[PDB]
Design an enzyme around this catalytic site. Sequence first.
Site, short mmCIF file in Angstrom:
data_model
loop_
_atom_site.label_atom_id
_atom_site.label_comp_id
_atom_site.label_asym_id
_atom_site.label_seq_id
_atom_site.Cartn_x
_atom_site.Cartn_y
_atom_site.Cartn_z
N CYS A 46 31.64 30.27 -7.73
CA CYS A 46 30.77 30.75 -8.77
C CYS A 46 31.45 30.61 -10.11
CB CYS A 46 30.35 32.17 -8.50
SG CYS A 46 31.17 33.51 -9.34
N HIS A 47 30.67 30.91 -11.17
CA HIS A 47 31.11 30.79 -12.54
C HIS A 47 32.50 31.44 -12.77
CE1 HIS A 47 31.49 32.21 -16.77
NE2 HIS A 47 31.39 30.90 -16.93
N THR A 48 32.77 32.56 -12.12
CA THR A 48 34.06 33.21 -12.26
C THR A 48 35.25 32.32 -11.88
OG1 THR A 48 33.01 35.27 -11.78
CG2 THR A 48 35.44 35.21 -11.49
N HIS A 68 36.80 33.62 -4.47
CA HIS A 68 36.65 35.06 -4.20
C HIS A 68 35.45 35.46 -3.39
CE1 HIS A 68 34.29 34.34 -7.81
NE2 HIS A 68 33.55 35.36 -7.41
N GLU A 69 34.57 34.52 -3.03
CA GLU A 69 33.36 34.83 -2.25
C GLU A 69 33.57 34.12 -0.89
OE1 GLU A 69 29.56 33.93 -4.13
OE2 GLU A 69 30.35 34.23 -6.11
N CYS A 98 40.72 51.84 -2.16
CA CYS A 98 41.85 52.47 -1.50
C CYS A 98 41.52 53.85 -0.95
CB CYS A 98 43.07 52.63 -2.45
SG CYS A 98 43.12 54.01 -3.68
N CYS A 101 43.07 57.05 -4.83
CA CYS A 101 43.40 57.17 -6.25
C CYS A 101 42.41 58.09 -7.01
CB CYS A 101 43.47 55.76 -6.88
SG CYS A 101 41.90 54.92 -7.11
N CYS A 104 38.93 56.50 -7.00
CA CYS A 104 38.27 56.66 -5.69
C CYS A 104 37.90 58.12 -5.41
CB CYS A 104 39.14 56.12 -4.54
SG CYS A 104 39.16 54.26 -4.58
N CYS A 112 38.51 51.10 -8.42
CA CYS A 112 39.83 51.45 -7.86
C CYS A 112 40.98 50.66 -8.51
CB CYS A 112 39.77 51.19 -6.35
SG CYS A 112 41.36 51.27 -5.48
N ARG A 116 45.54 46.43 -8.50
CA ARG A 116 45.19 45.58 -9.63
C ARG A 116 46.42 45.11 -10.44
NH1 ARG A 116 41.79 46.08 -13.15
NH2 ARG A 116 42.55 46.43 -15.29
N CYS A 176 30.19 39.12 -3.97
CA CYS A 176 30.18 38.95 -5.45
C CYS A 176 28.80 39.12 -6.13
CB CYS A 176 30.87 37.63 -5.87
SG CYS A 176 30.68 37.28 -7.64
N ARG A 371 23.81 29.02 -5.39
CA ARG A 371 25.15 29.05 -4.82
C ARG A 371 25.38 27.82 -3.92
NH1 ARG A 371 26.62 32.50 -8.14
NH2 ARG A 371 27.81 34.41 -7.64
N1 LIG Z 1 29.66 42.68 -13.76
C1 LIG Z 1 30.07 42.07 -12.57
O1 LIG Z 1 30.67 42.70 -11.73
C2 LIG Z 1 29.82 40.58 -12.24
C3 LIG Z 1 29.99 40.02 -10.94
C4 LIG Z 1 29.66 38.68 -10.71
C5 LIG Z 1 29.21 37.89 -11.77
N2 LIG Z 1 29.05 38.43 -13.01
C6 LIG Z 1 28.56 37.70 -14.20
O2 LIG Z 1 27.14 37.52 -14.22
C7 LIG Z 1 26.85 36.32 -14.96
C8 LIG Z 1 25.88 35.40 -14.23
O3 LIG Z 1 26.45 34.61 -13.16
P1 LIG Z 1 25.52 33.66 -12.26
O4 LIG Z 1 26.42 33.16 -11.13
O5 LIG Z 1 24.11 34.10 -12.12
O6 LIG Z 1 25.51 32.49 -13.42
P2 LIG Z 1 24.52 31.25 -13.55
O7 LIG Z 1 25.21 30.36 -14.45
O8 LIG Z 1 23.96 30.77 -12.20
O9 LIG Z 1 23.27 31.75 -14.37
C9 LIG Z 1 23.28 31.89 -15.82
C10 LIG Z 1 21.83 31.77 -16.23
O10 LIG Z 1 21.70 32.16 -17.61
C11 LIG Z 1 20.90 31.23 -18.32
N3 LIG Z 1 21.27 31.27 -19.72
C12 LIG Z 1 22.38 30.77 -20.33
N4 LIG Z 1 22.34 31.07 -21.64
C13 LIG Z 1 21.18 31.75 -21.85
C14 LIG Z 1 20.48 32.35 -22.98
N5 LIG Z 1 21.07 32.26 -24.16
N6 LIG Z 1 19.31 33.02 -22.84
C15 LIG Z 1 18.74 33.11 -21.64
N7 LIG Z 1 19.31 32.57 -20.53
C16 LIG Z 1 20.49 31.89 -20.61
C17 LIG Z 1 21.17 29.87 -17.64
O11 LIG Z 1 20.04 29.03 -17.99
C18 LIG Z 1 21.33 30.32 -16.18
O12 LIG Z 1 20.02 30.31 -15.54
C19 LIG Z 1 28.19 35.70 -15.35
O13 LIG Z 1 28.51 36.22 -16.67
C20 LIG Z 1 29.19 36.33 -14.44
O14 LIG Z 1 30.45 36.53 -15.06
C21 LIG Z 1 29.32 39.73 -13.21
ZN LIG Z 2 41.40 53.60 -5.20
ZN LIG Z 3 31.49 35.07 -7.68
#
Ligand SMILES: NC(=O)c1ccc[n+]([C@@H]2O[C@H](COP(=O)([O-])OP(=O)(O)OC[C@H]3O[C@@H](n4cnc5c(N)ncnc54)[C@H](O)[C@@H]3O)[C@@H](O)[C@H]2O)c1
Ligand SMILES: [Zn+2]
Ligand SMILES: [Zn+2]
Lengths: 378, 378
Positions: A46-48, A68-69, A98, A101, A104, A112, A116, A176, A371
């Site tokens: 994924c993007h991460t 990570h997935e 954990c 902590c 937790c 947690c 880290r 994820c 995905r």
């Molecule tokens: N908070 C958390 O724990 C956590 C966990 C996992 C992923 N994430 C985050 O969530 C986000 C999404 O990940 P994903 O795998 O769905 O990504 P993805 O790239 O599949 O989807 C992003 C979407 O946003 C759209 N987009 C881009 N710019 C845009 C704009 N200006 N206006 C409207 N739409 C726009 C794209 O067209 C795309 O459809 C990432 O920032 C990732 O870091 C957060």
């Molecule tokens: Zn913990």
């Molecule tokens: Zn991910």
Amino acid sequence: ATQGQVITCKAAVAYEPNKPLVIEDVQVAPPQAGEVRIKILYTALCHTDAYTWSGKDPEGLFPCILGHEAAGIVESVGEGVTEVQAGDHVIPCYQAECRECKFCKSGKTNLCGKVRSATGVGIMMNDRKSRFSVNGKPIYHFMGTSTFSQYTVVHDVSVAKIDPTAPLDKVCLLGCGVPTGLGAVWNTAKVEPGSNVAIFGLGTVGLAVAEGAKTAGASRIIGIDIDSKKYETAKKFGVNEFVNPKDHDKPIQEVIVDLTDGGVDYSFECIGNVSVMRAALECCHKGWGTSVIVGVAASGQEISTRPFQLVTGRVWKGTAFGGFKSRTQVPWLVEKYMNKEIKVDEYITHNLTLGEINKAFDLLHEGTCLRCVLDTSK
Amino acid sequence: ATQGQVITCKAAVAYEPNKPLVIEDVQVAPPQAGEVRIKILYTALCHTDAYTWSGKDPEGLFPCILGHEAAGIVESVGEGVTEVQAGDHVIPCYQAECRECKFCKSGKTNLCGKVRSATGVGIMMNDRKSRFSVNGKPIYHFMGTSTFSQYTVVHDVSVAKIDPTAPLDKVCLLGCGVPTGLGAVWNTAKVEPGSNVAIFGLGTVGLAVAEGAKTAGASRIIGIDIDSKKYETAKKFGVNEFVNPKDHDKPIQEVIVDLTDGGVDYSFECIGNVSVMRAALECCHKGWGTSVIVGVAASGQEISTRPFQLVTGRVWKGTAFGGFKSRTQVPWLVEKYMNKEIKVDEYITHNLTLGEINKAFDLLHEGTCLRCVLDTSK
Ligand SMILES: NC(=O)c1ccc[n+]([C@@H]2O[C@H](COP(=O)([O-])OP(=O)(O)OC[C@H]3O[C@@H](n4cnc5c(N)ncnc54)[C@H](O)[C@@H]3O)[C@@H](O)[C@H]2O)c1
Ligand SMILES: [Zn+2]
Ligand SMILES: [Zn+2]
Ligand SMILES: NC(=O)c1ccc[n+]([C@@H]2O[C@H](COP(=O)([O-])OP(=O)(O)OC[C@H]3O[C@@H](n4cnc5c(N)ncnc54)[C@H](O)[C@@H]3O)[C@@H](O)[C@H]2O)c1
Ligand SMILES: [Zn+2]
Ligand SMILES: [Zn+2]
């Protein structure tokens, strides 16, 4: 016959930013105290991962094994480990639980901090070194998971033990994106039946938000994306109205407020763009509207708004892994998937092999792709 | 008897921004449908009055009678008015509570829309004219209250009926700063017993937050002010630790995080300065910490932070009038005061007359001054 022995296996190693991963043989040390060695069967990306691979992450550390997935089967455990054993089916999680902590034990968060300090710097807690090497030199771990490998070693506090009949080529996504989106709705926001919702970004996370909102009984589920082709796909995840901000001169927040006679009850930002994060807050209804940041912004970027937006009743919050406790609740989400109560399969648009992982990175720039899942046996 | 008649009385009129108010005789017309004419006995002044007086409002309307914190005795009512009558003791409120509009029907009476098309431009709903004039020329209302006068006329949905034995020179404060502070604690944040709290700004509002927090059972109540001599009176309201940011090289948010080993459970910004608003958020504890912006700031500026602060569990909120419904709950606050459950007297540091109102505006810069109360009889 592997217990206690170094394992030699294939892994995708990133040596330098923004260049192709090389598939090598690597040495995977055995698990020390508190550690679990896992045979990874399937891993998604994924993007991460690509953020770090691209060199953009100031926390990045090369060479590393990303990923990570994933989902797999426990090969062995180190001294002291009692929650999992050899042969258990597992999901390694980037967020630990954990249970011991201040975070937790608080009852007020899923965040947690136990491991880290090791995992954020690509090493293990027990000896502050890596378990991976090639030609006797260390390769850093990533996110405490490192799942772009046939085998990994993780902390025991980061391993969720799952239904042993669940399919491992599907539930790898439960580590994820999917729980993040569902949980932003059910845990962070607590969306009530009949609520109207806006979802900025219709990738995997946005789509999981949409399914979580639909499941919670939301009414209008308005999707916003700069790529209009995303809507057709998003409909099956529960998005029922669509706006492309390019189709309007007015700022997107104004558009959403006009469409809803005041704004939505909840909004979710699923992109990582601070301007859109501000728009998501501002399209919430005054008095009671809430905005949940799910997207992860780049370093040094700031969100802004006017204080009046909060003073007149909007609430700004955000979510880490959907508010779920990883070891306790990922197995619950697997149960729900096995009972057909949450979607997982529909998010997997491509299947490749670990050997073909650079092809999977290219697939990230395809708007159709949600995905990719990688079979690590080839 | 004055009922049905134009009354002539002393008022302080603002002819234009930034000039001394003029203590004139003015004509106060009798009340029309849904209106109440009030004999104002005591009125205080606050920043909100000074904000318009100084021209710092995009476009205030002049000439006008300023003032919104007051208490008095109803002189007469218009057609259709049932909830109050002549001789009732009352507190006029800038926040309406009509109980009938879409916002009131949800609970958020602080967004009530019944009369704001008129109050927002210095007139009355019934005829869209003002009830004030001098030598036949109109003088605009302010905030629907116009309390810097011996008599005023306000909409019935803005009038709180109170205990006729409560001292009018004290309860004139219970229409603005004091409910806003208490209510930020009890209603907006819902502070639990044992909570650790930080309060930025120890004027009237911050002291009301301190007492709210004390009554709610908070443990550490840490006050922050650039004027160290504010701590003395703060201790009587419940503040039990104090930091002056001038005594520290690090930004205040970091000093508070260090003092509390991670951050407070709740923070309250009681100043109206956007950079303190950011610091108040950033001194909240990871995972659960919540920051409330207390009162409408009218800064015209932006608040900012890094979205990681919200992703990692901090929540950002704000409140206009502490979440209180003006007509229903201002009389409850008066009862609490009468039953010694909240303080009001200790806020009043200065007593002057309406004749001396320009000297009272001088006091608004006085470190020593919390509220100044004005006796309108001279
Ligand atoms: N908070 C958390 O724990 C956590 C966990 C996992 C992923 N994430 C985050 O969530 C986000 C999404 O990940 P994903 O795998 O769905 O990504 P993805 O790239 O599949 O989807 C992003 C979407 O946003 C759209 N987009 C881009 N710019 C845009 C704009 N200006 N206006 C409207 N739409 C726009 C794209 O067209 C795309 O459809 C990432 O920032 C990732 O870091 C957060
Ligand atoms: Zn913990
Ligand atoms: Zn991910
Ligand atoms: N709507 C408007 O027009 C307007 C304008 C300004 C303020 N207000 C409201 O005024 C309220 C506060 O009123 P009050 O009567 O309590 O005010 P006050 O002026 O008596 O108290 C403010 C306190 O903050 C302190 N302070 C100032 N800058 C500071 C800093 N950087 N760090 C720490 N302390 C600092 C001052 O020393 C003072 O004690 C706030 O609720 C604000 O929303 C409204
Ligand atoms: Zn006031
Ligand atoms: Zn109303």
